[PDB]
Every structure is written in C-alpha cells, then in structure tokens.
Ligand binder design. Structure first.
Ligand SMILES: Nc1ncnc2c1ncn2[C@@H]1O[C@H](COP(=O)(O)OP(=O)(O)OP(=O)(O)O)[C@@H](O)[C@H]1O
Ligand SMILES: [Mg+2]
Ligand SMILES: [Zn+2]
Lengths: 789, 176, 76, 530, 76
C-alpha cells in the first residue's frame, strides 16, 4: 500500500512546491524519515479515486470545500490535537475543516473577496453601499462608473446579499443542514433588490462580467471593483494604483464575502497517521515552516501578525459538503434572472431557495406514507414520526454485498427508499455478459471494478446518495468492519461466501448475562437467483434460522464421477470436463504453468476443439461452444426480471427492519415463474444442533487475581467438561494470543510462563472470550470470563 | 419473539478485531489435534500466530528417501472454506512441484472440503513423495519420465538431491 | 389418508399416504405423478424440512394437510 | 457487431435461445403511463433487448414521480413524463428503439380508433377503471395482448388479457420420461432382445443401462403371471426384488456392488408408468379449434390436428416418441446405442407427423412449406407439453352477470386471502369514481375517508351480491396508503410483469391465467381466474 | 480391544472396536473423524476384503490388528 515510514505529500502545481519540499528536507534530516512531494495534475480529482481503493498520499493540500466529500466517503482520518496548539491558529478556521462534529484537516492558508479602489480618484473607501450610487452621477459626468465588477457569478455578488442575513447552509453546532437554506430570507431579498436597483438606475449593467470590469479598472476607469489575492497581478502591469480596502457594509450589518481555506488532509488508509502529527503540528505549523513555504509563492496567528483577514473574519466560511454545488447553480441564475428583469427578486430567490435544497417538494412522498401515519398492521414497536425518515437519510448504515444482478438492483431499491449511507463490496470486474441484466454498467465500463462503477452511477442518478465502494472480497475485512452496519443485504453467487458472512455475523453476537443482547445483532437479508427461480430470506442472527440451518435447501451439487469422465463418457458435458480437468492440466497448451482461464476466448476455443474430438471417439453428439463455456465456467442462466423480483423483496424487507414499519418477512420466500408465477413463504425452523448458531458461550467465574493455571484446572477437572489437554487462546489488542498450547513443544515451552500470571496481568477483562479447543470438543468452544472481583 | 432496530448511530471503535475469526478458531483446533508422522516436523516462528508455520518432511522410502523438504503454510481468513496456501521452499525435482515453490496436491485445489484438516494436508503431502502424480504435473518433464522410464526417474531424483543437473538446470542439494 | 403437496410451480397434487410411511416414500409418491427426482425434493411442513428417515407421523401430518416442495438458489 | 450481441446476451440465450431472442428483437411493446411501475417493467424489457417500445404519457413529472423513479431526474419535474423517461430508458440498451407520444390513452382512443394496432403487446399501468374498461374493450376486439399493472401502496395487481394463447415450447421444470417400456416399439424390443443378461462378463453386466435391465426382467415377469405387468405397490416391490437378485455375486457369496442394478431398483417406481396421453393434451384435441379447420386456422392448431391424426394412425393411440432418455450408469457404447434407438424412432414419428400437416395444408390451401421442419421438431419433442391459455375479457369480469363469484366467495373463507386485496381495489376505484380522488392521499383526509371508503366497499359488495365480510383493518390500511406507489413494490411488479410479456412475445413458457395479487405487507402472493 | 485402519496417505485410524461389532460400524467412524461414507469403502485384511455383514471376530482378529483401506471407485 502507501509506503510506511515515508510521507508522500500531494499538492497543486500553482502552489509553491519548492519552498515546501524544503520544509520536508529539514524533516528527514532531523528524523531519518523521508519526504516526497508531488504536484500531480487533477489530484483533487485523483485523490477520491485512490483514497477509495486504499492507496494514495499520506497527506494532501486543498481547499476545505473538497474535504467535505472525502470525509463523507470516509477518505479522511479525524485529526486530534490539544486546545493549547489550537490557539496557535484562529478559532474559526477549524469549522471549515470539520465534518460530523469531527476535525478532518489542518488549516494552511485562507482567501476572500475584498473591494479594490483606485486610490487617487477617492482616497476615502466607502463604509456602506448606500452611498456607492451617489458617485456614478459625478464619474458619469466625467464618463466613468464608480463601481464595476463581475455579475455573471454569485460568488462576487454574494457578499452584499448575505450582509443582512444571507447564509449558504444553516450551520448548527457540529454539522451543516442541507434542508435549510438562507437565500430566501429578508436578509437576502433586501440585499438583492439593491443590486438590482443599481441595474435599473443605470449605476450598473447586469452584463458587467469579470473580463469586462477587468479591462476597465486596468485603465483606471472606475473607483472600485471586487477581487482578491489572485488578481493583484495585472493591476501591477498597468501601473494602475489601487488598494485592498474594506467591503462596504450594508443596512447596518457588515459585508460578508465567501471564505476559502487551504488545508491538509490525512488519508484514512495511510498508516503513517502519527507521522503526520509531527511534520504538521511541528515541521510546518510554525514560522520556520510557513515562511519557508511562503517565500516560494495564514491561519497561524504568530506568522499572520507578521484587509483580506477582516473580510474572512466577518464573512461566513465556504461550505464543504456536496449539496453546496447545487447552491451555486441555484443562486447564479437566481441573480442573472433578477437583475435582468426576467423575474422578481422575490420569486427569483424563491427558486434558489428550493433548488439549492436537497429534498425537492414531494421527493419522499411515497416513503413518508408509512412512517408518519399509523395503521392496524404496524410492528408493535412502531411510532409515527418525522425522525424515522431522517434516520434513513442520515445515519442508517446499510451494506450491500455483491454488485450486479441483485446487487445493482438493491442499490437502486435502497436509494429510492430513503437510504443514503450505503456501502458496496464486490470482488469482480465488469464483463460484457453482465450487460444483459446489470443495468448500472455500460459497454465503456468493461474491465472496471463493479463496486466502483456501481457507486458512481447511483450517486449521480439518485442525488444526495452516498454509496461507498469496496473492490474486495468480503473475506478480507474483519469483525470490526461489519459491526458498523445496522443491516446487511446479499446478492452473492456462491454458498461458501454465504456460509462465511453468516458466520461473521454470528461471531458478533454478545450474550450478556444469559440473554442475547439485541444490539449485538446485525440482521442479514439474503437472496439467490437461478433462471426463473429465486429465493429471499431474512435472518436475525441468534434468533432465527441462519444460513447453515437451511443449508440443505440447496439443490444437489453438480458433480461428475471420475470413472464416468475418464472411462465412460456419454453426455457432451462429460467430454468437456475431461478436457477441462485432465487433458489441459496434462498439456498446458498455452504454456507450462499457465492455468485455464474460462474468460479467455482462445482457451475456450482450444477446449471446444479438443472436446469435439473426445466426443468424436465416443460418438457423443451435442458439443457446442456455448455448452463448452457453460461447463467450464459452470454458468448459471440469468435475466433481469428474476433479479428484480428478488432484489425487490429483499429491499422491501431492509426497509421494514430499518423502520419497524411492519414486521419483516417471517424468514423465507421462494419464487418461480416458468408456469404462471408462484411464490411460497414460510418460517424456516431454526436447527436445534446447528453447527453455527446453536452454541452459546460457556460462562466461567474467576477472580482477576486468579492464576491461568486455575483456569486450566477448571477445564480439566470440572465434572461437566474435564478435558485432556486444552488449548487456550484469546484476542487482545486486536491480535490473536496463544495463552497455552500443549501439542507442539516449541509453543508449549513458550507459553507455560503464562500459567502463573494473573488474568489481570495477561490483559484479560470482564466479559472477555477465551477460545479453548480440545479432543473433547468437536469444535473450539467459547468461554466468557466474568470477573468476580 | 420480536426484534426492533434502534434508530441511533452505532458506538464507534478502531479497526482492531475484538472477536476471533472462524479461521483462528478452526486452526486453533486443527493445530491442537495435530498428529505428525515420524518423518514430519512442524514449526512456528511466533507462538501467537498459528496461521503461519513451516513443515519439514524427511522421507524414509520411495525415490526421495534421505532428503529434507521445507513447506510453508499460510492459513487465510477463509479457512476452512478456502484451503491453506502451501508453498515449497526446498528446490526439488518432483512431478507435482514447480521451481516457484507451487505444489500440486489435489485436496489443496479442487478436492478441498472444510472437513479436511491440517493433518489431512500433511498426509496428502507426505504421500506425494512416496508416489508422485503424473496427472497434475507442474513439472511436465519430471512427470513424463516417471511414467515411461521408472528407473531413470529414480536416478534423476538421487542425482538432483545430491546436488547437480537434470537437463540444463542445477538442482540445489537437499539431502537430510 | 390423502395429503396435498405443492410443487415449485404451485401445482398441487394429491397423494395417498399412511401415518407410518417414511418421508422418502412421500417423495417417491410425488415422483410417480410428477417425475420430480426425489433426490432434488425438499419438503416443508409447518416450517420444518422433513428428514427422509422420519415418518409422516413424527411430523404429525393430518388428513387434508398441505406439503410444499422448496428450494434455495445460489446465483447472485 | 453480431458476435458481440451473442456475448452480452449469453446468459439469457441459455434460457429462451436464439429463436426466442429473435422473437424478442422483432417485437414492439407499448407502455402506457410512465410511473415507477411502468418504468420498472420497461427496464426489464429494454435490457434483454426488446426490438422497440413506445411510452404513452400525457401527465407531467411531479415531485413525487421524480422521487420514486430511477428514470426521472430532478430537472424533469414540470416537463412531460413520457418524454423524460424515454430518455433514460434508452441508455440501457442502444440496440432498442425508443419513441413516445405525449397524449393520454383517452385522446388516442378518440382520434385514432386503431392506434394500438402497431404493437405486439400493450402494457398499461396505474389506470382508472374508466380508462381501463374502455381500453380493454378496444384491444380485446383488435385481438391485441393487454397486461394491466397496478401498484397501490403495498399491493401489486396484474391482469393479463389475451383471448387465446397457445404454446408449444412450455419448458416444463420436471416431467416423466417417455421410456415406452409398457408399450415397446419394434426397434426397441429388438434392442433389448440383443442383450443376454447371463452370458455377459462381469464388467458388461455392470455397465448396462438400467433401462435395459428393467426391460429384461419385465419380460420374465410377463411370463410367470401369464401376460401381466406389475401394478400394485406390493407387486412393484416384488419386482424390485426379482432384480435385486440378478446382481452378480462374489466368492464369499456376497452381493457385488452394481449401481447398474440399483438404479433399476429405484427407477422401477416410474419406469412401469403407463404411456398415455395427458388429459390436457386431450382437451386441445377434442376442441372446436382443432376439430374443425379452416383457411384461417393458425399454425398451432393445424399442428395440433396433425398430432391428433398421427395418434389415431401410426401413433396407435399414443403421442410420438419424445426421443430423449436420462443419464445413467453405463459404458459409452451401450448408452449411445440405446440412446440412438430413441433418437431414430423420434425422427421417424416426426416424419409421419409431418406428412399429415402437408396433408392438411394441401387440404386448406396453405403452402405445405409454411411450417418449417426445425419447427416440426419442437412440436414433436413437446407434444406431451402443449398448453393453451384463455383469459376472460375484462368486461366479463366487471359485467354484473358474468362476474366470477364462485371464486371470490370461496376464497374469502380466509379473512386474509389476498383476494380481499382485490375487493379493496375495486372499492378504491369506486371511491375515486365518486370523489375525483383517491382515499387518504393527504394525512388530513385519512380519518374521514376511512368511513367513506367502507361505504363504497359495501356499495360494491352489494351491487354484485357478495355475502363476504372484510376485516375493517384492510379499509384503514388502504386509506393509510394514500394511493402511494413505493418503489420496491413497483420494482417487484416490474420483474413479474416483464417476464409475462416476454412469455407473450417468445411464445415460450406459460403465462398466468388472470389476476395476480401481491402483498408486500406479508410477502405472499396468489393467482385467480376472474 | 484395540484396532487401527491404515488410510492410504499414511494414517492408521484408531476407531477402537469390539469383537461382535460388524465390519459396517467402522466405516461410519472412518466416516466421522474422516468423513468417508461406508459405501465408498472397501477394506482388505488378507487379500479377502471383509464383508460388511460379518463381524470383527470372523477374521481371527486379536488385540493387535492393523488394517488398510481402499475406497471404492464409485459412481459410474
Ligand atoms: N467473496 C466474495 N466477496 C465479494 N464479492 C463476491 C464474493 N463472491 C462473489 N462475489 C460477487 O457476487 C456477485 C454475484 O453477482 P452475479 O453472479 O450476478 O454476477 P457475475 O459473477 O458476474 O455472474 P456470472 O458468473 O453469471 O457471469 C459478483 O459480482 C461477484 O463478484
Ligand atoms: Mg458468478
Ligand atoms: Zn443456524
């Protein structure tokens, strides 16, 4: 992954990349740890891509407004320093670098719009807007306009509008509210009406775009224009004098331009997180760092002390969240129209108000029906409310295992039911054959990770959705990864994988004091499909039939006996298997070592040909290329409709469980439609001696001061167990620990010492699970250690 | 009985595992029910990691008698549904073992079943040195000789164990 | 004692069985009329899937009881 | 890009084949009203590659519509629904031709009285019982396939209306083999005769088709009973034992393991079944459409007639030999040889059957070549599986003297049988007739409408004289729905509806016979003839 | 009493047995600890492979009998 010990820093080209790398050289020179800084093109676009698949930079510099996106996709790590160090920087900058009540980046530089006036003409900068018009009459009497700036953009015009009370998105204590926009209030309507009047009174023209106003002030034709630290260059090339004077207040209240924060984010995967606290909080957040970086081409009080600040001070910080982009488009035309006399400020802002919001009128109308009202069939714990939907929309973490078929269908389904916090795991890449039913993939996507593409298609088609992809095997994540989810749904295509996730979820169960703790349960919804038959089932781990309980419901496994394949072929499939598992391995047609690849056209052809010949020797007919692929790949016939029926049911149930709207399917449904269409629903009985969910941890009570030997004596003497020679392991500090083992001398020697240390010494804790196996136990059993002292 | 999902965020935790994986629980059992033949010997560099270890086979019969072979086992997180990864670290002339260390034992590929245990693999491996399988050859030439000329194979085996060449490849001395 | 068993298509057939008969026999009776290989039959009755060894009695199958053939599909 | 089409359609060609895929690509379906339901249904047709579709929607994209639809973007709000959907459904498969018309069914039924004739099947979603009943009338008379789909809250409704649907390739999930041991044919008997179960070495005895084994012993029992063939379970069991003893024994005297004979033992339970015509196939034969031909009589029926003659002539009272046998433990040659006998036999009867259709096309005037041979082959392979479906017209359902009450009533014995969900839909439609709206759409209406609806229910139940009791719960629950169209319920229908439409186009598999009702509340479902 | 059956890959399985036990009961444990079905299991104790129906006593088996197992190449 990202190389441990070194820090690959990412930053932009037009940002001094040389005075900063030198602040990285003083680093390895002082610690031995090396720094590599790069300025890749499109890195703000390249980061999300790589930060998702794990790798990328340990740190990255960019405007806070992007980090809102990364944070949500879980690409950033929460930074955590003391209040003493936070005073070195300003008290407000931290919000711009925050998400969900958590700090996600360290502020580097800041920016804001200010008013620049031609000094000579007026060495008095206006303190409010009211007077600005009064001057056009004088200047026009000379042939000039007092003011002139870009109007085609809501960024330049926003400062005035906001003056009396215009706010992008309501900021409550820790997070932004995308449902409450401040562009519809009197504070904005007032500010906009003014800008428009000056458009009618001719003090200005709505056409004054950036380039027009520019070419004019560059000649010294206006008193002022609005800009910032990025525009001071061409005014110096024209010897036109000016200043960075204050932004005229308005209706009493002060002006409020928009606020940008340059900042560094710590990748959530980069293991070098503790290496970033140093290079930053020390080798940068100083005068020695920032100046060395600044001499090339601030939030730190000490160096800052050594007009742009005032504006950023009294102005509201520029949002970071995703909905912000719909804001710009919404108000941009809500100004164009206004000043252009295309509609009234009122109706103009009325639009901007709704268009910037995330949930247009009526959007969740079909859902609200079941959550806000009541009825004779709701789940006994159901209670009408407006919060349920917010739960669905804001925090209900749902995981979808499998992208494509049921997976693609499920994402769509969950997204149009209110769910937004969704994850998708899939280990596969896209294949042309997926395109007959997996509707989130297109021909141009062939070869790409399904999860990745599935997530990007949905997040776009269904606005405000936050699908997070995972190009992996479910099998390479741990128990801590699956516990974060409230619910998990499956669209897998193998029994092994189902047996596996099923086991993972039962392992999370906690049976406190004898009774299963309901909050340790993560409900599993599983669906399967084959041709026109399919099934769905709801599993509540530890409470209802689990995958292993009904394991027998699977049809008999496709199996070809060796004597048949090698000596008595009679079906064309028989010949194809011979070639696939005998002739190929023995000839390695495409090179010694090269395995058979069912997706490789040339491999299949070879197999098809050799199969035609095997068939020939036995007068067996029916060997076709289509059948050869079938046998080799072990293909399951598939179509969109059946995947839609099953994903539908599965989804309806995730909804019911997440909201308690109704009691969920009493675990099982079968569907078939070759003859009319039929379904059957039933409660699968929970197997009494199920190897997966019928075993409860055994409770043992010892004193924390007790010695591991006593635990060994208990296991060996205790009348109800009395094992020969047990093996005891445990999970401490996230790693497996062998406490005692006696069937391998080298290990037994090395663990005996543990036998005379107290359970408080070994690190064990109340409730802790000790795993012990022995010839006595058909399978390892779990004892839950309960401290009596 | 009824269930009801509570509508609150879940208490967070860092990616550190809190419960033993099914793999950890099965291997713990398999390692503890170990039954090494006189000719084999297992070893664990770290006593806390029962997922990684090495096996040593000093056969006393067949074409490889008097040699020493070092196999390494890597048990994944899909055990026992997935079989363990087994690599040979001793260079050897064998029909079922290539020069990359890859071994070709049936139960390690297609015949694998979760009822099988480490013992099963150690026996399956041991039996490979008694009688090689020319049906799943990772070393084609080695396999051919074994079928057609039974004596030459045996010869080529002894000479390669002592240190020397077969064709144009030098086989490292691997005698016990 | 006549009992009804519904197939995976929803087709319901009538079979004559005796309380003492084995579950695999029920399957044979089903195959006789529908051609469904008892090897691929999975029978449910009151939420339980019938073991081939147990008898119609052990599951307390009454007169006009209805049995359902079922399945689990593995495609994703 | 043809070798490309076959690559992305592989998984479905494995289900309905190249011919089915072609039927599909030659079709033109019509979707009326593009709400979640319709758009879901259409998506499941576009992906598989239907030739073309046309959406008829005069309505405008509302806030709600934009929310429960994967094919309506936020900006499509305000614009025409048909036009908005069509755009996204078209990105699903460039090999499909989409088009739309911004008018209601109503307008079209006024201006162009035969507008819906250019389609293979017409799919109608979310229609009032007025546009519905009217639309069903036109299409029924034009002999055009109609599928009505409704999504009310957590209920799914589906009405299929086709005067007559005859299908050959019904794809049965399971069926009895056509071994003909009970009525052997010449070549078959000669084949068994060639086997001498005593003079065979151990191996050949162990690798002998169980079908042969049973044919033999069956001959021995035909002797020791003077012309009989096992029939009772007691007799079948005796016979099982007769075979269980033919198993060659070893040196100890212990039975040798021969899966050869064990399969014989097991398949006796079916092998002795009496070859005969299925009752269903009977109905097709003794049917007016088959009894009396005409120059109008369509393919299926001419073909059915052929079989019918064949039966009375060469068939000797039985349908043509299927031609296939199942797999069994035997050595290649033994199996291939036995299998070939059935193949050739099949080919033969196929020819026979063929010479009776040419006999009919030349007696009807049709060209004796319209019916191809690749087509005759299926008719023979599927003679035992032919199926004919006939739906009553929407009219006969709504008509006051044709309404099927024998069913609705018997169904109601269970206060929860999904049928009550139909009764509630009719009533909901009634209410909407009287008040130009649906129950409980707004939260402030629920209370009130709970009673108003209870009335319409009775007004309806009484109008057709239905003694049935309906738990009041259903009434409240329906108002509670507010005529909502939840995406997951529209999606369930979209799958179910699409496949029924593909059954219609390809003429493969079997369609449901009338009304399908789904409850997402209890995840149960059912079918009724109405 | 004590007896072991040498499974090929080199393991002699102690499925300790009694005399009156029929040959058929071993396979069932050869089938547990190992999982091999009794049917796909032929056992040779002297050239003559033991007959299921017979007992351990039927083969002059004393408290020191090692056995060897040959699984039946079953299925067609
Ligand atoms: N252990 C696993 N971890 C993560 N994803 C898995 C695992 N096993 C299977 N999957 C995924 O489950 C999905 C099942 O989808 P589905 O069978 O419909 O598609 P598919 O694999 O492309 O189908 P086909 O084999 O017919 O081409 C696949 O996308 C597959 O990669
Ligand atoms: Mg697959
Ligand atoms: Zn279980």
């Amino acid at each position: 992954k990202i190389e441990e010990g070194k820090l690959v820093i990412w930053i932009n080209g037009d940002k001094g990349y040389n005075g900063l790398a030198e602040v990285g050289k003083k680093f390895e020179k002082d610690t031995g740890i090396k720094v590599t800084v790069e300025h890749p093109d499109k890195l703000e676009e390249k980061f999300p891509q790589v930060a998702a698949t794990g790798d990328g930079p340990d740190i990255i510099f960019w405007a806070h407004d992007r980090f809102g996106g990364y944070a949500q996709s879980g690409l950033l790590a929460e930074i955590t320093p003391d209040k003493a160090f936070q005073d070195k920087l300003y008290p407000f900058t931290w919000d711009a670098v925050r998400y969900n009540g958590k700090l996600i980046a360290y502020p580097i530089a800041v920016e804001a719009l200010s008013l620049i006036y031609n000094k000579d003409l007026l060495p008095n900068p206006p303190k409010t807007w009211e007077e600005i018009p009064a001057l056009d009459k004088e200047l026009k009497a000379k042939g000039k306009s007092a003011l002139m700036f870009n109007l085609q953009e809501p960024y330049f015009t926003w400062p005035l509008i906001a003056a009396d009370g215009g706010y992008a998105f309501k900021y409550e204590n820790g997070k932004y509210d995308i449902k409450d926009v401040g562009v519809d209030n009197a504070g904005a309507k007032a500010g906009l009406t003014f800008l428009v009047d000056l458009i009618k009174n001719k003090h200005m023209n709505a056409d004054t775009d950036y380039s027009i106003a520019e070419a004019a002030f560059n000649k010294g034709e206006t008193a002022m224009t609005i800009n910032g630290p990025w525009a001071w260059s061409n005014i110096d090339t024209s010897k036109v004098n000016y200043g960075v004077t204050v932004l005229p207040t308005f209706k009493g209240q002060p002006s409020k331009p928009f606020v940008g924060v340059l900042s560094a984010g710590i990748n959530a995967a980069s293991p070098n997180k503790e290496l970033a606290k140093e290079f930053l909080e020390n080798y940068l957040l100083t005068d020695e760092g920032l100046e060395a970086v600044n001499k090339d081409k601030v939030a730190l009080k000490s160096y800052e002390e050594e007009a742009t600040m005032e504006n950023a001070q009294k102005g509201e910080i520029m949002p970071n969240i995703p909905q912000m982009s719909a804001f710009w488009y919404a108000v941009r035309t809500a100004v164009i129209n206004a000043a252009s006399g295309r509609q009234t400020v009122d109706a103009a802002l009325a639009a901007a108000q709704t268009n910037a919001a995330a949930d247009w009128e009526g959007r969740w109308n079909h859902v609200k029906k079941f959550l806000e009202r009541s009825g004779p069939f709701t789940h006994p714990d159901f209670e009408p409310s407006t919060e349920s939907l917010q739960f669905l929309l804001d925090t209900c973490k749902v995981l979808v295992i499998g992208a494509g078929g049921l997976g693609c269908e499920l994402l769509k389904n969950l997204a149009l039911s209110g769910f937004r916090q969704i994850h998708v795991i899939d280990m596969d890449t896209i294949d042309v054959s997926n395109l007959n039913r997996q509707f989130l993939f297109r021909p141009k996507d062939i070869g790409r990770p399904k999860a990745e593409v599935a997530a990007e298609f949905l997040n776009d088609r269904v606005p405000n959705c936050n699908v997070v992809p995972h190009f992996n095997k479910i099998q390479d994540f741990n128990d801590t990864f699956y516990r974060q989810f409230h619910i998990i749904v499956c669209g897998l295509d193998s029994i092994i994988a189902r047996r596996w996730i099923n086991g993972m979820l039962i392992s999370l169960l906690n049976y406190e004091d004898g009774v299963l703790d309901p909050s340790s349960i993560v409900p599993l919804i599983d669906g399967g499909t084959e041709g026109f038959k399919g099934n769905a089932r709801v599993i509540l781990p530890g409470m209802t039939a689990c995958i292993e309980c009904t394991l027998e419901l699977y049809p008999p496994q496709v199996n070809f006996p060796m004597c048949t394949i090698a000596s008595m072929p009679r079906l064309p499939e028989h010949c194809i298997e011979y070639v696939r598992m005998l002739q190929w391995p023995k000839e390695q047609p495409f090179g010694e070592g090269v395995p058979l690849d069912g997706d490789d056209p040339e491999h299949i052809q070879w197999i098809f040909q050799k199969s035609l010949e095997r068939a020939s020797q036995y007068n067996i007919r029916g060997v076709t290329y289509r059948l050869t692929q079938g046998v080799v790949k072990r293909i399951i016939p598939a179509v969109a409709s059946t995947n839609a029926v099953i994903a539908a049911v599965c989804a309806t149930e995730v909804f019911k469980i997440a909201t308690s709207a109704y009691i969920p399917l009493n675990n099982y449904l079968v569907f078939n439609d070759v003859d009319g269409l039929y379904t059957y629903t039933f409660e699968a009985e929970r197997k009494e001696n199920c190897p997966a969910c019928s075993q409860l941890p055994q409770n043992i009570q010892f004193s924390p001061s007790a010695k591991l030997q006593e635990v060994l004596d208990y296991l060996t003497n205790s009348a109800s167990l009395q094992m020969k020679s047990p093996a005891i392991t445990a999970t401490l500090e996230g790693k497996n620990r062998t406490l005692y083992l006696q069937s391998v001398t080298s290990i037994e020697e090395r663990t005996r010492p543990n036998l005379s240390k107290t359970l408080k010494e070994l690190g064990l804790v109340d409730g802790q699970e000790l795993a012990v196996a022995d010839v006595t136990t058909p399978q390892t059993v779990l004892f839950k250690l309960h401290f009596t002292s | 009985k009824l269930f009801s999902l509570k509508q609150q965020k879940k208490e967070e935790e860092k990616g550190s595992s809190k419960k033993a994986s099914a793999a950890q629980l099965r291997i713990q059992k398999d390692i503890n029910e170990l039954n090494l033949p006189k000719t084999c010997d297992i070893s664990f560099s770290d006593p806390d990691d029962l997922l990684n270890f090495k096996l040593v086979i000093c056969p006393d019969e067949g074409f490889y008698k008097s040699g020493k072979f070092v196999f390494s086992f890597k048990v994944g997180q899909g055990y026992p549904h997935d079989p363990p990864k087994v690599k040979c670290e001793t260079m050897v002339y064998h029909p079922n073992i290539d020069l990359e260390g890859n071994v070709a034992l049936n139960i390690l590929r297609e015949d694998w079943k979760p009822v099988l245990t480490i013992n099963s693999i150690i026996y399956g491996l041991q039996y490979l040195f008694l009688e090689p399988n020319p049906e799943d050859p990772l070393n084609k030439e080695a396999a051919e000789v074994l079928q057609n000329n039974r004596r030459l194979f045996e010869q080529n085996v002894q000479r390669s164990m002592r240190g020397g060449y077969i064709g144009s490849t030098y086989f490292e001395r691997c005698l016990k | 004692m006549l009992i009804k068993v519904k197939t995976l298509t929803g087709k319901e057939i009538e079979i004559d069985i005796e309380p003492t008969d084995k579950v695999e026999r029920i399957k044979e009776r089903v195959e006789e009329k529908e051609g469904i290989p008892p090897q691929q039959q999975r029978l449910i009755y009151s939420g339980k899937q019938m073991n081939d060894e147990k008898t119609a009695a052990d599951y307390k199958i009454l007169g006009g009881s209805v049995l359902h053939l079922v399945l689990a599909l593995r495609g994703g | 890009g043809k070798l490309l089409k076959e690559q992305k359609y592989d998984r479905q060609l494995r289900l309905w084949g190249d011919h089915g895929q072609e039927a599909l690509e030659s079709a033109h379906v019509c979707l009326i009203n593009a709400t979640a339901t319709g758009t879901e249904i259409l998506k499941n047709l576009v992906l598989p590659g239907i030739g073309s579709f046309t959406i008829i929607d005069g309505n405008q994209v509302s806030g709600e519509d934009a929310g429960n639809n994967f094919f309506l973007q936020r900006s499509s709000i305000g614009k025409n629904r048909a036009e908005a959907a069509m755009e996204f459904l078209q990105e699903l498969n460039s090999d499909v031709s989409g088009s739309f018309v911004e008018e209601s069914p109503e307008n079209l039924l006024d201006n162009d009285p035969s507008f819906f004739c250019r389609f293979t099947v017409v799919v109608a979603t979310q229609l009032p019982e007025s546009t519905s009943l009217r639309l069903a009338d036109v299409l029924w008379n034009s002999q055009i396939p109609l599928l009505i789909c409704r999504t009310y809250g957590l209920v799914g409704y589906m009405r299929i209306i086709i005067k007559e649907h005859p299908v050959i390739e019904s794809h049965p999930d399971n069926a009895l083999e056509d071994l003909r041991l009970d009525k052997p044919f010449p070549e078959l008997r000669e084949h068994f005769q060639s086997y001498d179960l005593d003079h065979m070495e151990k191996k050949d005895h162990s690798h002998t088709p169980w079908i042969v084994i049973i044919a033999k012993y069956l001959a021995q029992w035909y002797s020791e009973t003077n012309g009989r063939i096992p029939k009772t379970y007691k007799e079948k069991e005796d016979f099982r034992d007769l075979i269980r003893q033919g198993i060659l024994k070893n040196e100890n005297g212990a039975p040798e393991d021969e899966e050869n004979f064990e399969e014989a033992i097991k398949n006796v339970n079916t092998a002795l079944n009496t070859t005969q015509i299925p009752s269903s196939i009977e109905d097709i034969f003794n049917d007016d459409r088959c009894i009396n031909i005409t120059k109008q009589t369509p393919s299926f029926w001419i073909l059915a007639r052929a079989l019918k003659e064949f039966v009375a002539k060469e068939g000797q009272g039985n349908l043509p030999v299927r031609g296939t046998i199942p797999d069994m433990i035997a050595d290649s040659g033994k199996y291939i040889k036995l299998q070939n006998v059935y193949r050739e036999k099949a080919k033969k009867d196929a020819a026979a059957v063929g010479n009776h259709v040419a006999k009919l096309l030349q007696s009807i005037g049709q060209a004796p070549e319209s019916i191809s041979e690749k087509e005759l082959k299926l008719l023979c392979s599927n003679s035992a599986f032919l199926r004919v479906v006939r739906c009553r017209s929407l009219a006969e359902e709504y008509g006051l003297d044709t309404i099927n009450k024998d069913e609705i009533i018997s169904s109601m014995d269970n206060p929860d049988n999904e049928i009550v969900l139909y009764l509630m839909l009719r009533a909901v439609d009634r209410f909407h007739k009287q008040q130009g709206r649906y129950p409980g759409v707004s939260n402030y209406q629920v209370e009130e409408d709970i009673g108003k609806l209870k009335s319409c229910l009775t007004g309806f139940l009484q109008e057709y004289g239905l003694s049935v009791m309906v738990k009041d719960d259903y009434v409240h629950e329906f108002c509670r729905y507010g005529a909502a169209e939840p995406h997951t319920i529209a999606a369930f229908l979209g799958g179910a509806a699409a496949q029924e439409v593909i059954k219609i186009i390809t003429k493969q598999f079997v369609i449901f016979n009338n009304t399908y009702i789904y409850s997402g509340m209890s995840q149960t479902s059912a079918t009724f003839q109405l």
